Write an enzyme that holds these catalytic residues in place. Structure first.
Site, PDB file in Angstrom:
ATOM      1  N   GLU A 164       6.718  -1.727 -21.020  1.00  0.00           N
ATOM      2  CA  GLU A 164       6.873  -0.294 -21.243  1.00  0.00           C
ATOM      3  C   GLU A 164       6.056   0.091 -22.461  1.00  0.00           C
ATOM      4  O   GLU A 164       5.486   1.184 -22.530  1.00  0.00           O
ATOM      5  CB  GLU A 164       8.341   0.055 -21.488  1.00  0.00           C
ATOM      6  CG  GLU A 164       9.249  -0.183 -20.292  1.00  0.00           C
ATOM      7  CD  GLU A 164      10.718   0.017 -20.622  1.00  0.00           C
ATOM      8  OE1 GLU A 164      11.528   0.004 -19.680  1.00  0.00           O
ATOM      9  OE2 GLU A 164      11.065   0.181 -21.815  1.00  0.00           O
TER      10      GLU A 164
ATOM     11  N   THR B 289       0.938  -1.118   0.000  1.00  0.00           N
ATOM     12  CA  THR B 289       0.000   0.000   0.000  1.00  0.00           C
ATOM     13  C   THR B 289       0.983   1.171   0.000  1.00  0.00           C
ATOM     14  O   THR B 289       1.902   1.203   0.819  1.00  0.00           O
ATOM     15  CB  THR B 289      -0.910   0.044   1.262  1.00  0.00           C
ATOM     16  OG1 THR B 289      -0.106   0.062   2.441  1.00  0.00           O
ATOM     17  CG2 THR B 289      -1.852  -1.157   1.297  1.00  0.00           C
ATOM     18  N   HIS B 290       0.824   2.106  -0.933  1.00  0.00           N
ATOM     19  CA  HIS B 290       1.745   3.242  -1.038  1.00  0.00           C
ATOM     20  C   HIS B 290       3.134   2.699  -1.404  1.00  0.00           C
ATOM     21  O   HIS B 290       4.146   3.368  -1.204  1.00  0.00           O
ATOM     22  CB  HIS B 290       1.843   3.998   0.296  1.00  0.00           C
ATOM     23  CG  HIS B 290       0.537   4.539   0.792  1.00  0.00           C
ATOM     24  ND1 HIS B 290       0.016   5.741   0.364  1.00  0.00           N
ATOM     25  CD2 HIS B 290      -0.348   4.044   1.689  1.00  0.00           C
ATOM     26  CE1 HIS B 290      -1.133   5.964   0.976  1.00  0.00           C
ATOM     27  NE2 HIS B 290      -1.377   4.949   1.785  1.00  0.00           N
TER      28      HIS B 290
ATOM     29  N   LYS C  43      20.880  -7.693 -16.804  1.00  0.00           N
ATOM     30  CA  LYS C  43      19.925  -6.777 -17.417  1.00  0.00           C
ATOM     31  C   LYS C  43      18.789  -7.447 -18.183  1.00  0.00           C
ATOM     32  O   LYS C  43      19.011  -8.137 -19.178  1.00  0.00           O
ATOM     33  CB  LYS C  43      20.652  -5.813 -18.364  1.00  0.00           C
ATOM     34  CG  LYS C  43      21.296  -4.614 -17.688  1.00  0.00           C
ATOM     35  CD  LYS C  43      20.379  -3.401 -17.688  1.00  0.00           C
ATOM     36  CE  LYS C  43      20.252  -2.804 -19.080  1.00  0.00           C
ATOM     37  NZ  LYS C  43      19.368  -1.602 -19.115  1.00  0.00           N
TER      38      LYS C  43
ATOM     39  N   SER D 116      21.594  -7.547 -22.370  1.00  0.00           N
ATOM     40  CA  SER D 116      22.921  -7.069 -22.729  1.00  0.00           C
ATOM     41  C   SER D 116      23.925  -8.196 -22.536  1.00  0.00           C
ATOM     42  O   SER D 116      23.856  -8.947 -21.559  1.00  0.00           O
ATOM     43  CB  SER D 116      23.322  -5.880 -21.854  1.00  0.00           C
ATOM     44  OG  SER D 116      24.648  -5.462 -22.140  1.00  0.00           O
TER      45      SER D 116
END
Lengths: 453, 445, 443, 444
Positions: free
Chosen positions: D275, D140-141, D268, D262
């Site tokens: 996105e 939460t938050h 990575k 990568s």
């Protein structure tokens, strides 16, 4: 059906609320004082009448400040209320102030007068935020942390470089805010109903009295345009976008999982049973406000799209929209400044986040400097990460003998590569994260801020 | 997953950045040769190879595949096919993250010049017609209701000043567009002490970015350009609305050329303002792009992410749309025909009741009294089955003894309009002043 | 600062009654769960009825100290019943209270909007039925195209509004889904009985997942979205009447209650009411854009971002409620000027009918059109109107013309051709009025 | 220029098939109305199928010379049937053709979107049933709050998406309302059988008013509106997984198909796909904003403004279609890291459960909380965790503590408290799974 007659009160509740109208009382008093002086010069008012008029207005001004200026629903707007009040303490003479003046020009004038003042306050708070970021960057210039791309660790960077990126964006907002101010200071008063003032009024006098930089070129445009409103909100929206991204950055960085920053108790909330839990209420608030401001931008554009080039009740929606934006922006910049000046960075957690792997690119840049082509240098460092990986160790622990099998170009000084400080110091070219570039950025920003006068 | 490619920027969009990506690559190569990463010999081959690709791109034969995902990758492959291994050296210390921001800005730099030219042409057209038709007088409106006589030229000039503010805003945007981000690397900046000043020079940019993180992750120049384009469109949507209403047969003040309207063989009177309706609807298309980009940027980390990719399609649509609309608008304004006779007839006597009031004001009577008096006159005329322009001087004296013989000058649409001599009004001298001022601002731009 | 950054008190106070109503249901359920004794429940129920009594006289207050209405209700209970009041919070969270209260409020708000929407639609159909014989010019591209019944015009708007009405009904059913009993995020940890909560609050169902129930604002978004399209409809109706009410067109005249005038210009009636209505479309759209941006890209949990929902949705309901009543007043009191509508009906407007006449005589459409065009051109050169051409004149163009062609030059015969469902023929318009009356019969 | 402002060829081509079908239906209605002979009908129909099989191999070239797909089809019909083709336009208008075609197209598009939306929903519920035993911290938050079943999380998205499915269904009802037979504005003047057109086009009903049928674009706004809320949901899911697939959190790992890596940074895993999904929400929102602004303030009749509906709605369907398939793949191929989720559950997160314990023992909640607060504070001062306190220590704070208090320190027991409908208890999660499976099956 619905037969009310010749009034229907329900349509009155669709107009600007009285709490909103009251916000323009002062600027409307000043505007009228300027107009009165211009009328005397045009021989519409005698010096005696001007004196009774200016005195009465001053009295009303005092009432507005005390918050005792009463306004009724019958006074549909503040302009009417103010004319009623003047007649109340001065008598019939008051009616001569509206000679050749239209409500169409009053509203645009008053709104512009109010914004000229509001922009200044906004500007002040903006610069404080920028100064706060630049100064904190200069102080914590030695801090190094991981830089990200796609929210994935890419390479080591200076925490100050991060702070400076935001400072630079906010400086562009500052610049846009300044450009908008020049167009807001163009006084439209003296445009009458639509064709202009019919009494040869001296608009240059109005400009001087009101401290405006210039006067409108065309009466029709001055009365029906709301560009100044659109720009301001537009500029305020992009600024809010920037703050929404910073809020996002700090919300992530303040998670226990990242543990890079900790907010002051003043800008967070916690649980008595979970003394470790610190909710970034302040940042979430800032982020959400980006939506409220954008909403006002969308509304005003829709309102202006496709309506005739003249005055119409449609334009009335501009007051609530801009006032909401200026108040929101004002409170938000102050909270942001607080958050940034009172937050704590956890240098410990930042370093521990910097693993050796993050230096594999520097390992290839090393070869590149020895003359080896980038393509070959890249694959070389790749074999290094593969070798260490198999040997159950990190690359910084690979003997000059292990590397030597990958390429003869690996000398003893190759050990210098495995240093977060050497890593960040490679970027000395303008704008990079090297200590020297950061210092130059801070200097240029300080100069820009100074030029904000 | 192949579908991943489907959501990526289309090939026809990537091809739009071929020329600028090449210019950015040549400048970078010259900077690498100076940093001694490239030998004078390697520099020549690369430059020569890029020139060849630049040639193919211009003939429209530079092929790109879905596998190349962006124009940058297609350019590199093509260079390698033309020069071989040496080509790879060109990407030393350079990042995809910085190429796209550089290419858009380079492209946008060109676009703005084009837009500006057409904007200026539209404004000059309005200003010039205003001067020619300075003597025409039509009814002025408020709430789309006849209020008072006014000069048609005053109307044209209102749109002209609004457009000049757009012109001014475009100039301010351009200054921020020309800031070169090339040399920011992946995020921390360039690691090979590249000479960014050289790049700036080779690319005709006014300056270079101060911070690498910002220069790579910001799209202010995109949102800023679209905002300006949006307000500009709002102005044209307002001009379209005015002209659509004026071109109805009910109003009959203007008539569009056949070039910007459609008609029917069975109805010669019918002339549909297609061009105006098209212009009006484009305001929404541009606004849509503004809302899109703002929502894309809201609440995402201050770094590079794939979200940014939506910028290309959005800004090209705006620049392409804006370019075409400006020309169509200039065309409409240039070839439209005004109907003087119809503007004349619309000017009824009642429209001067206010001048009748200002007449008494100049004679000393308080504004409040003057309106009442003038209101009595308008009623007297009703109860006479006549207009106010023809009331006996006796009929007026009964309202107020202030009515003299010179009160007959009020019943002139020309004397009416000539009252507004203060800066900005419809008086000829004032309209002439506006024209002169805009004529100069144009020069200063 | 929060003094102007937090949700306003005027908005928070509007959630007073439903929060009390929600707290009463929770208390009853707490007693069934043994958390409250029969005696403790009476005390709490008693105090709450008292706070409701005060709220009935605008008594209950709040201060910046009381961040929200939930906190003020709690404070008032305590200082009116004792620490016992604190038992009411057992296993309850603010996260679920705010989303519960809002849904409870909107449930009654939709009924209000709905009632007013239907009055508008009813006003349009009944008027159409009375003025079913009025004929006026129909337009395309704001250019006269052909004769049409004025009622057909009124009904086009009435049918659009019924789609709005239908959408309001669909939103209603998702609003009445009770989220109370979801706790902080994982649900109620006290085995509370949610079915008892639903029936007490008179809701149609309960949420299936606790996380979703706490973090979704779909109901806010689709309510505003439906309101936005409805406003788009009113903005178009406003444009139509603004154009039709100009002196140049002169088809309608607004009553003094929805117009503004001047003593100096008796013939000037400003359509303020229509201009206000048109701009409100922008105002509502603005609320849509805002909430959509607030929700975009934030984690699937409770966060302070969600706070913006209250102000936005209430501005929409208040605006909508006022706009609909104002729309009704304008439509029921405006005056049509039949003389001006008829005078705008010119002969050339019948040129298309002249072509259909030939088509009915067996001539293919393409040729019939060229034939009608010739007649049009011939009339111009002779300086007369198409309806004044002689049969010899027409036969010279096509021997297919006959004495019955004279029936074509009647504005009434023209509109009576469109008998196909939805057309302007009297029989068609009559069918629309009947069906719409039928639809309006849905409560 | 005036034309570079008109919809593009590839966009108009998307309407070839539906325009063909609408024309065949109109032809049949014409013949029945005695405008065409039983013979002429055959000529036209045969010529229309030829063009249909022609657009089959993509042989139809819009030529750009034609202003729209309607014109191209009329020109190409004459080119192989002769002047008889012209009779097809009797009483028909371009105004009613564009709206008819758009609706015919969307009716099929909705079907495709629907198919992929349900697959996505089913994937979430079935994985929720498979990984029902995994427990993780709840936030939460974005701050750890309490233990929660990871399946509870997945289901919260499935339920949101089921709301989108329902909204998609309600929009379909209004899209299958046939506007053909409305003419230019006043309706059809040849007494054509609209009922025949409806069944020939497989539509649900026909428009009630010709003026409304010609100028309204509600069906466009509704679809995009529904699509926008759906994308908002996916933008939130993208945010969740982007944070969860972070190294710092390490709860989720994406497959190579939906991520980029990568060679130098083997660690990575860029969440490219997520996105991408997050930004499309803005793309779709933009189309919504554009159309609402196009419609605002324009007269209740046909005008060129309306032509912007085509590109906007098609961009929306193409985006939704693609985005849902990618969303399904991400959810079906992602990997959870049970160790990381587990080792993230700290004893501190059970302090609330300690308070509940006392509440079940009859202690007032407020007192129960201040008590656990003392235990929390006592543990700190001693430099140990809450679960390491002895009965003695606890009993000094309150006698209500017993030896069974030890059960409270189980993340399993913790989550098993939420047995009320919709909670994280295992039996509640299963109940949810059962309801959605039946709700998905109901889709028939």
């Amino acid at each position: 059906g619905r037969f009310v007659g010749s009034v229907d009160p329900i349509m009155e509740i669709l107009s600007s609320s009285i709490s909103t109208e009251q916000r323009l009382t002062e600027v409307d008093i000043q505007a009228s004082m300027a107009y009165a002086k211009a009328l005397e010069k045009a021989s519409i008012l005698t010096k005696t009448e001007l004196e009774k008029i200016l005195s009465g207005l001053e009295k009303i001004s005092e009432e507005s400040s005390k918050g005792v200026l009463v306004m009724t629903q019958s006074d549909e707007d503040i302009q009417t209320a103010i004319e009623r009040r003047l007649k109340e303490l001065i008598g019939d003479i008051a009616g001569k102030l509206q000679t050749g003046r239209s409500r169409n020009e009053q509203v645009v004038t008053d709104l512009k007068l109010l914004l000229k003042s509001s922009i200044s306050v906004i500007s002040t708070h903006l610069l404080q935020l920028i100064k706060t970021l630049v100064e904190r960057a200069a102080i914590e210039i030695d801090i190094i942390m991981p830089g990200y791309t796609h929210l994935q660790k890419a390479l080591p960077i200076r925490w100050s470089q991060f702070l400076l990126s935001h400072a630079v964006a906010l400086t562009r907002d500052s610049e846009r805010l300044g450009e908008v101010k020049k167009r807001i200071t163009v006084l439209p008063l003296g445009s009458g109903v639509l064709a202009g003032n019919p009494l040869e009024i001296d608009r240059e006098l109005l400009r001087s009295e009101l401290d405006m930089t210039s006067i409108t070129l065309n009466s029709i445009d001055a009365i029906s345009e709301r560009d100044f409103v659109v720009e301001l909100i537009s500029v305020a929206t992009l600024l809010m976008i920037h703050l929404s991204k910073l809020a996002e950055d700090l919300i992530i960085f303040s998670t226990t999982e990242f543990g890079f920053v900790t907010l002051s108790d003043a800008y967070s909330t916690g649980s008595s049973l979970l003394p470790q839990k610190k909710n970034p209420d302040s940042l979430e608030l800032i982020r959400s406000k980006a939506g409220r401001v954008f909403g006002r931008l969308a509304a005003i554009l829709m309102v202006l799209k496709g309506i005739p080039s003249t005055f119409s009740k449609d334009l009335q929606e501009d007051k609530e929209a801009v006032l909401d934006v200026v108040d929101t922006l004002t409170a938000v910049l102050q909270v942001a400044t607080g958050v940034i000046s009172t937050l704590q960075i956890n240098k410990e957690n930042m370093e521990k986040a910097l693993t050796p792997e993050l230096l594999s690119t520097d390992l290839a840049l090393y070869l590149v400097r020895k003359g080896m082509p980038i393509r070959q240098a890249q694959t070389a460092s790749g074999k290094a990460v593969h070798l260490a990986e198999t040997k159950g160790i990190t690359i910084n622990n690979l003997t000059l003998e292990d590397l030597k099998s990958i390429s003869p170009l690996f000398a003893s000084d190759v050990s210098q590569v495995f240093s977060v400080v050497n890593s960040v110091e490679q970027y000395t070219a303008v704008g990079g994260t090297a200590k020297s570039s950061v210092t130059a950025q801070i200097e240029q920003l300080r100069e820009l801020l100074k030029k904000q006068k």
